[PDB]
Design a protein around this ligand. Structure first.
Ligand SMILES: [Zn+2]
Length: 258
């Protein structure tokens, strides 16, 4: 027995094992576009993924992560509301059982079909494990996905899901360019938050892009064929692996545009 997204171990139950679930800077949150404040002080985001080295894709029971070599500054995020350099370590998605839900953050209560999270850690802390213990340890880039035209750069990811259908399975996944997943514009909102699944640490500086990226119904459908369970166990489709919006509390969402 452990946390998950079922009826008996879902988000509403997490607080019992992870008290921080009721913390002061929990994520995700609803972005009210009319209360977000434009901040001219915010610099443009600097995404340098030209030297990114993807290594593997794995199904960890609650999503699938596409891991990168973070032993050097190969793929980094700088600028924006960030101080210092943040290295990309992995990216994953959260999606729903229907196209009308799936994203974690919502914009004016609007839910998207899915949400892509590119996780980066602050190099000043040495390693990922140390970074999660700091208030400015991680910087996650969030991108919304809407159902429409297919996204060419995502197909490579879609085609390998068959090999990692169940929990614990992994597959070599080299030479994948994450630049194919970015929208045209880099305008964003940002606020201090946390990791949206246990252990829900409040070490995140969220940077959610305003412009969604379109994927076809066929591409999202393949996400829904994954399993939460391990091989040989009863099948339970991996869908609705998103946490609902949490109270904003004493936080301000800033926008890089107006
Ligand atoms: Zn995530």
């Amino acid at each position: 027995h452990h946390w998950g997204f079922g009826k008996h171990n879902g988000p509403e139950h997490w607080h019992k094992d992870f008290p921080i679930a009721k913390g002061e800077r929990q994520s995700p949150v609803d972005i009210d576009t009319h209360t977000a404040k434009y901040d001219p002080s915010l610099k443009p985001l600097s995404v340098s993924y030209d030297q990114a080295t993807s290594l593997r894709i794995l199904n960890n029971g609650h999503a699938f992560n596409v891991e990168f070599d973070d032993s050097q500054d190969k793929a980094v995020l700088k600028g924006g509301p960030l101080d210092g350099t943040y290295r990309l370590i992995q990216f994953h998605f959260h999606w729903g059982s229907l196209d009308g839900q799936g994203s974690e953050h919502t914009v004016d209560k609007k839910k998207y079909a899915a949400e892509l999270h590119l996780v980066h850690w602050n190099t000043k802390y040495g390693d990922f494990g140390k970074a999660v213990q700091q208030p400015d340890g991680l910087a996650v880039l969030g991108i919304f996905l809407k159902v429409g035209s297919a996204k060419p750069g995502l197909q490579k990811v879609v085609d390998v899901l068959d090999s990692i259908k169940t929990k614990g399975k992994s597959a070599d996944f080299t030479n994948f360019d994450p630049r194919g997943l970015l929208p045209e514009s880099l305008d964003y909102w940002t606020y201090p938050g946390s990791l949206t699944t246990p252990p829900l640490l409040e070490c995140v500086t969220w940077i959610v892009l305003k412009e969604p990226i379109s994927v076809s119904s066929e591409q999202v459908l393949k996400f829904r064929k994954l399993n939460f369970n391990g091989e040989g166990e009863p099948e339970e489709l991996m869908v609705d692996n998103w946490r609902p919006a949490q109270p904003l509390k004493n936080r301000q969402i800033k926008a890089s545009f107006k």
